[PDB]
Write an enzyme that holds these catalytic residues in place. Sequence first.
Site, PDB file in Angstrom:
ATOM      1  N   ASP I  44     -27.992  -0.096  30.898  1.00  0.00           N
ATOM      2  CA  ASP I  44     -28.753  -0.985  30.331  1.00  0.00           C
ATOM      3  C   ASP I  44     -28.117  -2.457  29.993  1.00  0.00           C
ATOM      4  O   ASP I  44     -26.487  -2.576  30.177  1.00  0.00           O
ATOM      5  CB  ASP I  44     -29.618  -0.631  29.143  1.00  0.00           C
ATOM      6  CG  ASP I  44     -28.856  -0.251  27.986  1.00  0.00           C
ATOM      7  OD1 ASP I  44     -27.511   0.054  28.110  1.00  0.00           O
ATOM      8  OD2 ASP I  44     -29.681   0.132  26.719  1.00  0.00           O
TER       9      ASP I  44
HETATM   10  C1  LIG Z   1     -22.934  -6.970   9.782  1.00  0.00           C
HETATM   11  C2  LIG Z   1     -24.244  -6.633  10.711  1.00  0.00           C
HETATM   12  C3  LIG Z   1     -25.190  -7.740  10.825  1.00  0.00           C
HETATM   13  C4  LIG Z   1     -26.518  -7.098  11.472  1.00  0.00           C
HETATM   14  C5  LIG Z   1     -26.640  -7.568  13.022  1.00  0.00           C
HETATM   15  C6  LIG Z   1     -28.107  -7.651  13.259  1.00  0.00           C
HETATM   16  C7  LIG Z   1     -28.607  -6.283  13.438  1.00  0.00           C
HETATM   17  C8  LIG Z   1     -30.042  -6.258  13.940  1.00  0.00           C
HETATM   18  C9  LIG Z   1     -30.262  -5.483  14.985  1.00  0.00           C
HETATM   19  C10 LIG Z   1     -31.780  -5.053  14.828  1.00  0.00           C
HETATM   20  C11 LIG Z   1     -32.611  -6.255  15.567  1.00  0.00           C
HETATM   21  C12 LIG Z   1     -33.045  -6.092  17.017  1.00  0.00           C
HETATM   22  O1  LIG Z   1     -33.205  -5.059  17.205  1.00  0.00           O
HETATM   23  S1  LIG Z   1     -33.869  -7.598  17.979  1.00  0.00           S
HETATM   24  C13 LIG Z   1     -35.171  -7.229  18.846  1.00  0.00           C
HETATM   25  C14 LIG Z   1     -34.558  -6.493  20.057  1.00  0.00           C
HETATM   26  N1  LIG Z   1     -35.678  -5.646  20.698  1.00  0.00           N
HETATM   27  C15 LIG Z   1     -36.462  -6.424  21.888  1.00  0.00           C
HETATM   28  O2  LIG Z   1     -36.079  -7.726  21.947  1.00  0.00           O
HETATM   29  C16 LIG Z   1     -37.656  -5.654  22.653  1.00  0.00           C
HETATM   30  C17 LIG Z   1     -37.070  -5.181  24.101  1.00  0.00           C
HETATM   31  N2  LIG Z   1     -37.231  -6.217  25.057  1.00  0.00           N
HETATM   32  C18 LIG Z   1     -36.148  -6.270  26.035  1.00  0.00           C
HETATM   33  O3  LIG Z   1     -36.610  -7.152  26.716  1.00  0.00           O
HETATM   34  C19 LIG Z   1     -34.918  -5.500  26.336  1.00  0.00           C
HETATM   35  O4  LIG Z   1     -35.169  -4.097  26.151  1.00  0.00           O
HETATM   36  C20 LIG Z   1     -33.739  -6.127  25.444  1.00  0.00           C
HETATM   37  C21 LIG Z   1     -33.155  -5.111  24.484  1.00  0.00           C
HETATM   38  C22 LIG Z   1     -33.760  -7.546  25.101  1.00  0.00           C
HETATM   39  C23 LIG Z   1     -32.421  -6.031  26.588  1.00  0.00           C
HETATM   40  O5  LIG Z   1     -32.292  -4.689  26.958  1.00  0.00           O
HETATM   41  P1  LIG Z   1     -32.281  -4.495  28.649  1.00  0.00           P
HETATM   42  O6  LIG Z   1     -31.846  -5.793  29.497  1.00  0.00           O
HETATM   43  O7  LIG Z   1     -31.435  -3.420  28.962  1.00  0.00           O
HETATM   44  O8  LIG Z   1     -33.563  -3.994  29.090  1.00  0.00           O
END
Ligand SMILES: CCCCCCCCCCCC(=O)SCCNC(=O)CCNC(=O)[C@H](O)C(C)(C)COP(=O)(O)O
Lengths: 64, 157, 58, 108, 546, 55, 125, 117, 88
Positions: I44
């Site tokens: 991924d």
């Molecule tokens: C010092 C520490 C600071 C903290 C830093 C921030 C930490 C917070 C992390 C949590 C916030 C989130 O998850 S941010 C939100 C993230 N989740 C999404 O976007 C929904 C999924 N949609 C998609 O298009 C894909 O799965 C995608 C994953 C984008 C790409 O992976 P692939 O292309 O393989 O598919």
Amino acid sequence: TSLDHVFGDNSNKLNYNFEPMGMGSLFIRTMVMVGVFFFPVFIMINDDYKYTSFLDKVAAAKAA
Amino acid sequence: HGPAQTPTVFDKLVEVTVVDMNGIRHRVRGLQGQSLAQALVEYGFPDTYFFPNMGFYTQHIVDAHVFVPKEFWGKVQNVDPESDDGLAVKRMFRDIVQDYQRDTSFFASYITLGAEHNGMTVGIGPIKPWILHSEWAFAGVHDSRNKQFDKPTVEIW
Amino acid sequence: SMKTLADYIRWRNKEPIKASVEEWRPPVPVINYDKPQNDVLSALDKDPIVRRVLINPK
Amino acid sequence: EAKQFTPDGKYMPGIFSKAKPLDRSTQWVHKNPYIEAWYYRRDHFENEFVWNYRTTIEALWFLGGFTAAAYALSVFAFRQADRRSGYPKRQILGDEPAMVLPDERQFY
Amino acid sequence: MFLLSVFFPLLGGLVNTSPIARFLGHRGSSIIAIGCMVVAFISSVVIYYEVVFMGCAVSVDVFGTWFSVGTFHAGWTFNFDLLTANMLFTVTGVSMAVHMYACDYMRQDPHLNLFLGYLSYFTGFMCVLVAADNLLVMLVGWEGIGVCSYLLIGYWSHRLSAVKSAQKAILVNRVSDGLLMWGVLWVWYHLGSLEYDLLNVYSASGFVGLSILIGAMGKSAQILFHVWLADAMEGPTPVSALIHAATLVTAGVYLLVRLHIHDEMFVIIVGSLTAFMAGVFGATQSDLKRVIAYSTCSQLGYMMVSLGLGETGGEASMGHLMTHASFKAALFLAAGMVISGNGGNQHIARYGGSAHSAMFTMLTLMVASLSLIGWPELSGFYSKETILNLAAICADPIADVAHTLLLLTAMLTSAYTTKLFYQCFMVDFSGSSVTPVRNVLPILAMAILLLDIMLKVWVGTNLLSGMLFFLPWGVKTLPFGLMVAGILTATAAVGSERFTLIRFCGSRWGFDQLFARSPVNPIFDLGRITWAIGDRGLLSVGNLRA
Amino acid sequence: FSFTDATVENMRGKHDMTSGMVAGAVTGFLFGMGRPMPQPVAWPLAFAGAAVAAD
Amino acid sequence: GAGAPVKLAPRPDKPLPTWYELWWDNGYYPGQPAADFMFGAWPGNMTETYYLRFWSVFGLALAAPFYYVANFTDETRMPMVPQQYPAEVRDVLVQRRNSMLKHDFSAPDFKEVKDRAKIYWTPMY
Amino acid sequence: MASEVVLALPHKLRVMRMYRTGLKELINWSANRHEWYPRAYALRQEFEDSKALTDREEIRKKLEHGEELLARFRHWEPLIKPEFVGGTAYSINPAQPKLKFIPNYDAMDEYKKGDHL
Amino acid sequence: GFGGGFLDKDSVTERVLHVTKHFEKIDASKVSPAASFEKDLGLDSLDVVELVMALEEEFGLEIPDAEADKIASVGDAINYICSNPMAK
Ligand SMILES: CCCCCCCCCCCC(=O)SCCNC(=O)CCNC(=O)[C@H](O)C(C)(C)COP(=O)(O)O
Ligand SMILES: CCCCCCCCCCCCCCCCCCCC(=O)O[C@H](COC(=O)CCCCCCCCCCCCCC)COP(=O)(O)OCCN
């Protein structure tokens, strides 16, 4: 452009308008600078005032 | 650099049709970068058509009153009316032209011949009597066969 | 109305004209997250994500 | 690959020569148009002066303000020097008739 | 032998920078530099034994009179007394080992002989500074080491940050140089001479001690002047060792110890605040050279407080200067060897193990670090404990707060020095370059400074070593417990969750950022006003169009 | 100008350059009123400068 | 390792700002402001308001103990008097305003020596 | 909050840059690499708990909060490899560019080597 | 040595193939030059972020972010590393 893939490219530009500082900020910081870098002048003026007020006290209580 | 054309004078030639004050049309050839007053002098026009540019440090330049059509109004060079050159043009309009002035009135030294002037038709405007000194004046009548080109010097004194 | 010497003096009360042309900017390196921090005390310092990924792992 | 000297010295100008001669203008800079424009504008920056609000305020508080501060400091230093030298009050420009120029034949 | 300690490093610099060096090359210039330092060190050893032990000062009229207008009389004269002999021994002995190190460290530099000549000039102007008998030849030495510091900090001139660090050092020191010049004017006006032996002050006009203190705070990098010291790490490692051990930063402390015309409240407050500030600054850095730079600033704070304490405190201040130079130069040389063994990396998160360095580099770092943290019966133990015990019995109530600040600083120093050892050697490996250096010249350079560390224990700096200032066992053995507390905390590698305090301290309290706009941007804007609004505006007279 | 000069003269009880400067400031402000702004300051300065040069 | 690659800085290809001499362009990428932190983002994204706000507490936290001991504590806190000298040695030692022997509260001229240790700035005439 | 460059990215590259910068900032705040490994694992597990989301408002809220966290925890002294921009070994001793030479310039056109008037 | 500041293609290929195989889901026999990270290998986006950071560690590079966005296959990584004068 032969090293842009190694050290970065020229696409990101500097965010600054090259404009002068605000008038109040400049005035306040200049007054603070005058107070800090010219403190012997204020020390000697205070010395002259403290000296002349004592002579005022002497001349007041002497002729009574 | 390759087999491209040798430079000819015909590449830099500009042709202007000039109508003198008698209504006679004339064919005037010039070169690019030459002013219009210089091409008029070198064509062989009489000395009564020309007068000094009345600025400081430029009275050695001869100039003529020309009528320019509206299409070629934007190809006359720009003069700031607040500058000293503007006051020179104002002095020339005040003293030399006077009530011969029209909306097409310009001065020929302020026209620099280029390819955009090719085929432009101008006319010579009339002027009032004037004097610079005893050796350069105009009594008011265009009755003289002496060319301006045949004068060896233009004398400010 | 009345004609005076004030008509002949070039007073310096005309603002200079600027242009809408884009000015030159030198290139600089990229800062990915550049929000200016003004708060000495913030709830983001005690955020549960920070506790989960920085403080708590052994 | 020019040849501007004979084998026994004797500089040659190379006016009609094909090869470009090295000379005084060999290392003259290639002018950047915007740099030339910026230097021209900074060379004629007196055309950009205007009596707006900021110009008037900064010309009052900094130029006139520090000039008045320096005049006050100069008068303060003059008076303190005359007091620490045993002199009376001395006549500066616009100060009524008083003592100027101490006498060397006098003990102060 | 007396003039050979001053002239002869200047001669080595003159040889290695002139067109004579076009005939010697790198190989010949290294020989010339090392020999020209060995001769000067031998001369300084003879001077030290004659003046310190047998008590016979020597005054030399070298080049006649410099300039003499009215009653202002400056002469080209030296005087070699106790302080001068102490300083000459220290400067030449440290600079010899730094030259022997630099002839191998900068071997792959393209302009090696130029670098060696700059090092020799810097050493020679320091010798001129401490050998002078009046204030004006001292100012020759002051500005000479300033100029050579500029040339050596910005040595790698194609790097912009190095050039800006050198300019910053010049400008920050120029402020204090102006105040020091005005103080010299006060001193000469109200005492009539410039020679040190005729400057005996009991009660002067306040501006004297204050302005001379400000001029000393510039060179010794105290509070509100320390900002240039950390950025001076842009220069190569021998430059940093010679700046932080023998030249430059010890000049202001030497000047205050020599003159003894200060007012003690300012001196004690400035020194203790500097010591605490540089202690907390060095505890939160990860650049290997910046931690050592901040420890230098902290120890200069200790010496400042000591010379505030009194004449005995002035002697203890000179003693701590003398013992500090040896282990500080040793620390910088060992850090340079660790950096070169790890591919040029200066971050302490990318070290670990005992493969990237020689056995002698690790031993040098360990022994100099133990002397710095005041481990018992090593070199720094005697001088640092002397200053601490003298601060515990001062009758000024201001010195009560200063002693507490010094004890907190001692715990912080034993924390971050132990952290420097722990990250470098004890933890698992986290770099990727293992090229350990085992050349003869840098190892002998480190061994000489370790020999001087042993010499300071065996032969003291002055008579204070072994004198007992009568303190209870609780007050006396507390700094040992503070050293142990720092060691235990740093080996436990514990951290706090108060991240805003961590980022306030790690960003070094924002002094540089606040200075970037409290004087600097206003100076630029006032220049804009004076040019555009004044010269082009209010005072400009235009033309008459006609 | 003449009335302001003699009024400040009689009000201050003495003859000096202050009355001329005040009269010049008043007269120049009368001349400079209603004009764009370098002028309501520039004309009092010019009339006061004429008074100062006269003295 | 001399001769490492380094990226060059581009020349201006647009009209320049009026106050362009606040950027230091030395020829290589990247240039810098004339003084660091004068403009651009500060390290750690902190601001001037951050430092001034933390300093408005931290400065009085450092100036608090010095004021307390200089105004609410005196020479008598010590369990002993300063070092004792013969009169001919002491009389020159306490002429220095710098000396720590003026804190000898058992001296017969303790007050007069303290009154002579007041710092002056302008020498009177 | 993200910069104007990161706000212009596509959503996939935006999340990728956020994860990459989080890993780098965890390197900067750690004492060693062996301290960094379980923090890297924890940050990876943190991103895996939002992978199966579909509501764009919840995605936007989580993304913006994480970008605020990364703007808060930007280290004041980042770890840069020395021979790159911001490193300690960048731009020290570069090879000289070709500079042109003029031989015997004083001997060319002697007696006429001043300024005109 | 060899090359005008650039590493050879074969050793770069070997090192990239070594770095790529450090996943649990990866079958080792599918790892080849010119193999796509997502379609062919089954990684991924977060796995690709970790792989590029590991290649930064392997060759001692500070890869700029826009360049790390473009790397999407084994052959892309090999071609990028062979164009670095700073790759060790
Ligand atoms: C010092 C520490 C600071 C903290 C830093 C921030 C930490 C917070 C992390 C949590 C916030 C989130 O998850 S941010 C939100 C993230 N989740 C999404 O976007 C929904 C999924 N949609 C998609 O298009 C894909 O799965 C995608 C994953 C984008 C790409 O992976 P692939 O292309 O393989 O598919
Ligand atoms: C771009 C900056 C470069 C910086 C250069 C280094 C820093 C220099 C700083 C100080 C410069 C001072 C130089 C002064 C030059 C000579 C001035 C004196 C002239 C003169 O006739 O004096 C006589 C000359 O003696 C003598 O000169 C001694 C006689 C010869 C024996 C020793 C020979 C000198 C060996 C020096 C080695 C290299 C040292 C490098 C500095 C001494 O007698 P006097 O009339 O003054 O009488 C009084 C004592 N008798």
